[PDB]
Amino acid sequence: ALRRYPSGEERCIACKLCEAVCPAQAITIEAEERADGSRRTTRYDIDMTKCIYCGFCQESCPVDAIVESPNAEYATETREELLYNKEKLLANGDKWEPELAAAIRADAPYR
């Protein structure tokens, strides 16, 4: 899931750290300057059929932007449905934010 701030801005600033550390090269990021001059991603794809669910992407984030929700129930029909683009990962964060914020609140001291 891709999360926001309380304001509503995306937390992601396109550092690409989660792309460098990916053990399976499952993340593809393309960034540029947004209309307002902010450093933001234009592409954010996660191959759910390449990913090993290690959690490394979320340990490396400096802004808690990428997380792994507790959702394990999302079998799909086609594997095209398993190519998450930035429109799906943001939609996931909007959906799961209370539970994401809660899990972060529990584990942050240990992180």
**Which segments within the chain are labelled E, that is strand?**
27-33, 39-47, 83-84
The encoded tokens of residue 76 equal 């799909």
Per-position x/- string for 80-109, each x denoting binding to another protein as judged by CB under 8 A, each - no binding:
x--x-x---------------------xx-
Q: How far apart are CA 67 and CA 72, in angstroms?
A: 14
Smallest distance from another protein to CB 37, Å: 3
**Using CB under 6 A, which of the segments 8-16, 69-77, 79-87, 90-98 binds ligand SF4?**
8-16
Using the contact rule CB under 6 A, the part of the chain among 60-68, 81-89, 90-98, 101-109 near ligand SF4 is 60-68
DSSP state of 33: E
Is 54 assigned a ligand-binding role in the annotation? Answer: yes
- Cβ atoms of 50 and 24 closer than 8 Å: yes
